[PDB]
């Protein structure tokens, strides 16, 4: 595509520059180009890919929510413009899912990369579910659930309970349960068991790993506090 003539290394360097400049659309396009070089991504590169698209879709989600709220209060311009933002959001989700399925997930053998990508697949189907209506909604929801579940199965077998990727997966799957699947009890059970099992493993960590794990545990606690 449009980044095909740029060296992989230059795309990575430019992604990091874009992050510093808070140019997340550029950052995402550089990382998409890097993925399309066909080589597996390092841990740092996976994180650059995720941070880039999370910022892009995050802006779209916030905008979509504002417009959806106005539309509901109003109940063609509001509907048309909400639809425009919605289609752009769906396009970004489609692009990310496309990268994961061509061919990041199938080449990811290590737990840390496979869980990372499967969590992303769950996340971007979840973002689609937030704007979906009706039956498409049902199939989208089941695709999110399926990706999260496979990620959870691998994570529980291959990573310690304090692993930040595992923790972040469990955090997001619990919000999926609460907000998307209308399963608040499942969400609470997951967040509680995840928090408790991580707490019991903190004694094994260095000070820096301790800080990484406790940061995500605090997000689990923040949600439990709002939920119970």
């Amino acid at each position: 595509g449009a980044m095909g003539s740029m060296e992989r290394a230059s795309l990575i360097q430019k992604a990091k520059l874009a992050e510093q400049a808070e140019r997340y659309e550029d950052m995402a396009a550089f990382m998409k180009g890097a993925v399309e070089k066909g080589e597996e991504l390092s841990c740092e590169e996976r994180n650059l890919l995720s941070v880039a698209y999370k910022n892009v879709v995050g802006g779209q989600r916030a905008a979509w929510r504002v417009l959806s709220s106005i539309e509901q209060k109003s109940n063609p311009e509001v509907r048309e413009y909400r639809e425009k933002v919605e289609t752009e959001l769906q396009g970004v989700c489609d692009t990310v899912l496309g990268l994961l399925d061509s061919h990041l997930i199938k080449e990811a053998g290590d737990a840390e990369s496979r869980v990372f990508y499967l969590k992303m697949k769950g996340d971007y189907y979840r973002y689609l579910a937030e704007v979906a209506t009706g039956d498409d909604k049902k199939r989208i929801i089941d695709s999110a659930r399926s990706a999260y579940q496979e990620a959870m199965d691998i994570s529980k077998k291959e990573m310690p309970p304090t692993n930040p990727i595992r923790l972040g997966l469990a955090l997001n799957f619990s919000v999926f349960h609460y907000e998307i699947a209308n399963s608040p009890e499942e969400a609470i059970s997951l967040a509680k068991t995840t928090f408790d099992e991580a707490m019991a493993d903190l004694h094994t960590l260095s000070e820096d790993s301790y800080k990484d794990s406790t940061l995500i545990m605090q997000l689990l606690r923040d949600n439990l506090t709002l939920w119970t």
Binding site: Y24, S50, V51, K54, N55, V56, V57, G58, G59, Q60, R61, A62, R65, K119, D123, G168, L169, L171, N172, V175, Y178, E179, I216, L219, L220, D222, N223, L226
Partner: peptide, 10 residues
């Protein structure tokens, strides 16, 4: 919005 992983960009 409930807390999820990574940048709180929305």
């Amino acid at each position: 919005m409930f807390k999820t992983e990574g940048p709180d960009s929305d």
